[PDB]
Ligand SMILES: O=C(O)c1cc2c(s1)-c1ccccc1OC2
C-alpha cells in the first residue's frame with residue numbers, strides 16, 4: 001500500500017480549496033523515483049464543473065480520499081506484477097484539478113474553483129526532496145490519459161525546478177500513456193454550443209482561459225498568445241521538449257474515438273475508411289519518436305492495469321521495452337525501444353486486451 005500525505009503548503013489546493021496531496025511507498029535501498037499522474041477528462045466552465053462536482057467529487061476534492069491505496073501495474077512492488085521498476089520509490093498523485101495538469105489559479109472572490117495542477121506537481125516534488133528524493137538518480141514522471149498529457153506539459157518544468165534548487169544530478173524523464181491525441185476532423189461534426197458538442201480544440205481553448213493554464217516555454221514561444229491550445233496535442237509539443245520521453249498510445253484509443261463522434265455499437269465503407277485513416281495518422285505522428293509503444297487495439301490506458309504485462313508488439317512487452325529504454329540511456333541487440341504496430345484494424349494484434 002501507498003500512504004496518503006496531504007500537502008503541508010495548504011495554499012496548493014484541489015478545485016474546491018481542500019488541500020491537494022500524494023500517496024507514497026518508500027524503498028530505502030533505491031535511488032529510483034516514480035511519480036504517477038492520474039487522469040480523468042477535465043471541465044471548462046461553471047456549468048460543467050458544477051456537474052462534475054456532483055458525481056465525480058473525488059476528482060475535485062480531497063475531503064473523501066482514503067488513507068491508503070494499493071499500487072497496481074507499474075506502481076506494484078511485486079516483481080511478478082511489475083518486471084520493470086518493482087523496487088522503486090512509488091508516488092501516486094491524485095488528479096483533483098480538472099485542468100489537464102496545466103492550471104495556476106486559486107479560488108477567490110472572482111473564481112468559484114481553483115485550477116492548480118501545474119503548481120500541485122511542483123509542490124509534491126519540493127516536499128519529497130526532504131523525504132529522500134534529494135538522493136535520487138532518476139525521477140520518472142509518468143501518467144495515464146489526462147495525466148499522460150500532463151507529463152508532456154510538465155516534465156521540462158520539473159527538470160528546471162530541480163536544477164534551480166541545486167540538484168543537477170537527478171535525471172528527469174517522462175512516460176506518457178494514453179495522452180497523445182489528434183486534432184483531426186470528426187466522423188460527424190457539431191459546432192461548440194454546449195459541453196457534448198464542443199470539440200477538443202475549442203474546449204481546451206476555453207479551458208486555458210478559465211484555468212489560467214500554462215504550457216512549456218519553447219512550445220509557448222512557437223505558437224504565441226491565443227494559440228497555446230496547440231501545446232496540448234502531443235505531436236506538436238513533443239518536438240519542443242528536452243527531457244527523454246517514452247510515448248505509449250493505443251492506435252485506436254477509445255477517448256480519441258469518443259471525441260471524433262465514433263461509437264462502435266456492422267461497419268460500412270465510410271466508417272471503415274475513417275478508422276483505418278485514424279490508425280495511419282497516429283502511426284505517422286510516431287515515426288520520429290524513438291521510444292514508443294503503440295499496439296493496434298481499441299482500448300484506453302495501460303501502465304497501472306494489473307495485466308499490463310500481457311500486450312506485446314513484434315513479440316516485445318511494455319515492461320521489456322521500458323527496460324531497454326533504461327539501458328539505452330546509460331541500438332541494442334534484441335532489446336528494442338521503438339515498437340509501433342503496422343496492421344490496420346483494431347485487434348489485428350492477437351495480444352490486445354480482451
Ligand atoms: O480520459 C482523459 O483523461 C482524456 C481524454 C482526452 C484528453 S484527456 C485530451 C487531452 C488533450 C487533448 C485532447 C484530449 O481529448 C481526449
Ligand SMILES: *[C@@H]1O[C@H](CO)[C@@H](O)[C@H](O)[C@H]1NC(C)=O
Nearest residue numbers: 009010011012119120122123
Ligand atoms: C506555497 O505555494 C504557493 C503557490 O504555489 C507559493 O507561492 C508559496 O511560495 C508556497 N509557500 C511555501 C512555504 O512553500
